């Protein structure tokens, strides 16, 4: 039906070489910090261009190291604040050596010695107990990913994989613009860090950490209901569904929504959140919100969701997309 929709247009006929003209789509990426905006951008390069070559991935190695060192130090420092002891008291020396090694370098690095110290600390029961209470302090979301894969990351000849790259946390400053072609549509994607359609990202896992989820709702409320976006397709990405899935097992939605009375399961809890956001639409009869549960780090899921998102654009906004 999208193909049929496109086929009705007659504007290329008005241009001398219309069949060679580029139909443009301006896409804005919005959402609170750390909600996954920049990961969506990487997935576009991976899916619609080449993405990350081994040479490109090599440039992210010290970032992978930096992220790994920050995660462990965060957990170790939290133990102090939360009064949690080491499972085996021999680790207290490793905790100190962690600070000695990190305190003597300027940027991320990895040595056999450092790798040894981190692996022993990570495997400790008191450290694991502190990890399981991460909702109480600031800890990188990719902490377990890198930490559990230390052995591979620690090898002298390590070359970061695409997943290693997608998992990195690199704060964005300034507005970042990316161009890619999908289904013959020329997308100009803006990651407003620091309009045909808008993709609003939400970190579902921020619910049990004003409350973060509520601040995200506040931002979506204003964005979604803004007059400038009256003719823009509003897409909602309820992201980090993989992390939310593991969290909802032991953490209750009531921490975020006290009035929530449904069962504390993935199905009911996720459904509740979607309804909370879509209900902010003050024009439920004139505007439709397009919601997708995503895992921005999963290339396959993002390719699927973006395919669906593109069909909505073709069916809803093609007439407002110019030829260049
Ligand atoms: N597990 C998991 N991590 C994610 C997901 N989306 C993003 N991340 C990670 O969360 C962090 C922040 O994402 P990022 O794209 O930097 O957020 P931004 O601040 O919105 O640009 C990065 O370490 C990502 O790798 C997701 O769906 N699942
Ligand atoms: Mg970013």
Swiss-Prot record:
* CDD domains named among the record's database cross-references: G-alpha
Spell out the residue ranges making up region: G1 motif. 26-39
Q: Where is this region: G3 motif?
A: 187-194
Q: Which residues of the sequence carry a binding annotation for GTP?
A: 34-39, 141-142, 166-169, 191-194, 239-242, 296
Region annotated G2 motif sits at 164-172
- Tagged with keyword Heme: no
Function field: Guanine nucleotide-binding proteins (G proteins) function as transducers downstream of G protein-coupled receptors (GPCRs) in numerous signaling cascades. The alpha chain contains the guanine nucleotide binding site and alternates between an active, GTP-bound state and an inactive, GDP-bound state. Signaling by an activated GPCR promotes GDP release and GTP binding. The alpha subunit has a low GTPase activity that converts bound GTP to GDP, thereby terminating the signal. Both GDP release and GTP hydrolysis are modulated by numerous regulatory proteins.
Q: What is this protein called?
A: Guanine nucleotide-binding protein G(i) subunit alpha-1
Q: What is the lineage of its organism?
A: Eukaryota, Metazoa, Chordata, Craniata, Vertebrata
**Gene transcribed to yield this protein:** Gnai1
């Amino acid at each position: 039906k999208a193909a049929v929709e496109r086929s009705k247009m007659i504007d290329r006929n008005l241009r001398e070489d219309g069949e060679k003209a580029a139909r443009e789509v301006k896409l804005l990426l919005l959402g609170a910090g750390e909600s996954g905006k920049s990961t969506i951008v990487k997935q576009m390069k991976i899916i619609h261009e080449a993405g990350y070559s081994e040479e490109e991935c090599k440039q992210y190695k010290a970032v992978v190291y930096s992220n790994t060192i920050q995660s462990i130090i965060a957990i170790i420092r939290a133990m102090g604040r939360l009064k949690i002891d080491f499972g085996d008291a021999a680790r207290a020396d490793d905790a100190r050596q962690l600070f000695v090694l990190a305190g003597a370098a300027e940027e991320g690095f990895m040595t056999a010695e450092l790798a040894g110290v981190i692996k022993r600390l990570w495997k400790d029961s008191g450290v694991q107990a502190c990890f399981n209470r991460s909702r109480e302090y600031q800890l990188n979301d990719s902490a377990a990913y890198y930490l559990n894969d230390l052995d591979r990351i620690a090898q002298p000849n390590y070359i970061p994989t695409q997943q290693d790259v997608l998992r990195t946390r690199v704060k964005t400053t300034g507005i970042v613009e990316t161009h890619f072609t999908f289904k013959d549509l020329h997308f100009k994607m803006f990651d407003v860090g620091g309009v045909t359609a808008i993709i609003f990202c939400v970190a579902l896992s921020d619910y049990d950490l004003m409350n973060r989820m509520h601040e995200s709702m506040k931002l979506f409320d204003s964005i979604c209901n803004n007059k400038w976006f009256t003719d823009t397709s509003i897409i909602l990405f309820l992201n980090k569904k993989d992390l939310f899935e593991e969290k909802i097992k032991k953490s209750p939605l009531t921490i975020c929504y006290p009035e929530y009375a449904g069962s504390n399961t993935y199905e009911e809890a996720a459904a509740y959140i979607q309804c909370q956001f879509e209900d902010l639409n003050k024009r439920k009869d004139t505007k439709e919100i397009y919601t997708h549960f995503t895992c921005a780090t999963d290339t396959k899921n993002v390719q699927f969701v973006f395919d669906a998102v593109t069909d909505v654009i073709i069916k809803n906004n093609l007439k407002d997309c110019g030829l260049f």
